[PDB]
Design a protein around this ligand. Structure first.
Ligand SMILES: CCCCCCCC/C=C\CCCCCCCC(=O)O[C@@H](COC(=O)CCCCCCCCCCCCCCC)COP(=O)([O-])OCC[N+](C)(C)C
Ligand SMILES: *[C@@H]1O[C@H](CO)[C@@H](O[C@@H]2O[C@H](CO)[C@@H](O)[C@H](O)[C@H]2NC(C)=O)[C@H](O)[C@H]1NC(C)=O
Ligand SMILES: O=S1(=O)NCN(C2CC2)c2ccc(F)cc21
Lengths: 101, 51, 50
């Protein structure tokens, strides 16, 4: 059912269901993408394709507000703020410093 | 942070829900539930450097 | 609300109560409430600290 899933954007969708009032059918997207306008012709993929084609009503997922997605679908107003940042290993060594004294 | 972005419940182009999801997000944010859910998941093991 | 304006370009923070009466755009700056207070005046170890 809807009982298969858990997480942040499932607990968010319960809280949006309690406040506004609706029932919801959580369906996994078939492509596995979110949205990407293929520059060879211009076509959407993933969730943004299934909102333009009206196969969905909501897109409760990490679907980041960008300039290009906003011109084809309508986002809500952010439930989480972020930015792009660098992921890298911690340095597992110690500075020797033989003149530490 | 390189830029500043944000998530959001995507609705189709001209849906009547994006003015009701917007209200129901701003309500959850002042009640402190959007922080209460984030503290439930993003904490996990609170890794120290302890040493 | 009285339609005497068309835009409200100012630090007009998106709240729950204002959004039900006007329509904001989508934020041009992010923030939160935070505490402002003086710095403690510092240390000044004297030269005869030993
Ligand atoms: C365990 C080892 C001990 C060894 C020696 C024991 C003997 C006694 C040793 C020291 C006794 C000193 C009296 C104690 C003062 C109390 C604190 C004080 O008032 O600080 C004052 C410091 O201004 C001074 O008084 C500096 C004086 C130094 C004395 C010289 C040491 C003896 C010399 C060698 C002796 C042999 C010579 C050989 C034969 C001639 C000012 O107060 P303050 O607020 O703390 O300062 C910060 C404010 N400010 C930055 C603007 C300044
Ligand atoms: C902490 O610092 C403040 C800021 O300097 C001190 O208050 C005043 O400092 C100015 C410096 O220009 C003086 O002109 C005033 O006369 C000070 N006010 C007084 C003495 O009432 C304050 O004294 C400091 N307090 C502590 C506990 O260090
Ligand atoms: O993508 S947005 O809706 N608009 C752009 N911004 C601010 C410019 C940083 C922000 C800042 C924080 C957000 F959560 C969302 C957005």
């Amino acid at each position: 059912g809807n009982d298969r899933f858990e997480g942040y954007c499932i607990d968010l969708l319960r809280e949006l269901s309690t406040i506004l009032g609706f029932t919801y059918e959580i369906r996994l997207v078939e492509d596995g993408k979110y949205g990407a306008q293929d520059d060879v012709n211009g076509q959407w993929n993933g969730m943004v394709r299934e909102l333009i084609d009206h196969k969905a009503d909501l897109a409760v997922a990490p679907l980041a507000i960008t300039y290009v997605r906003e011109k084809v679908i309508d986002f809500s107003k952010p439930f989480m703020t972020l930015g792009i940042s660098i992921l890298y290993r911690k340095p597992n060594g110690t500075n020797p410093g033989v003149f530490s004294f | 942070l390189i830029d500043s972005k944000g998530y959001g419940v995507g609705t189709p182009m001209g849906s009547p829900y994006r003015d009701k999801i917007t209200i129901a997000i701003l309500q959850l944010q002042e009640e402190g539930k959007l922080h209460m859910m984030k503290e439930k998941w993003w904490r996990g093991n609170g890794c120290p450097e302890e040493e």
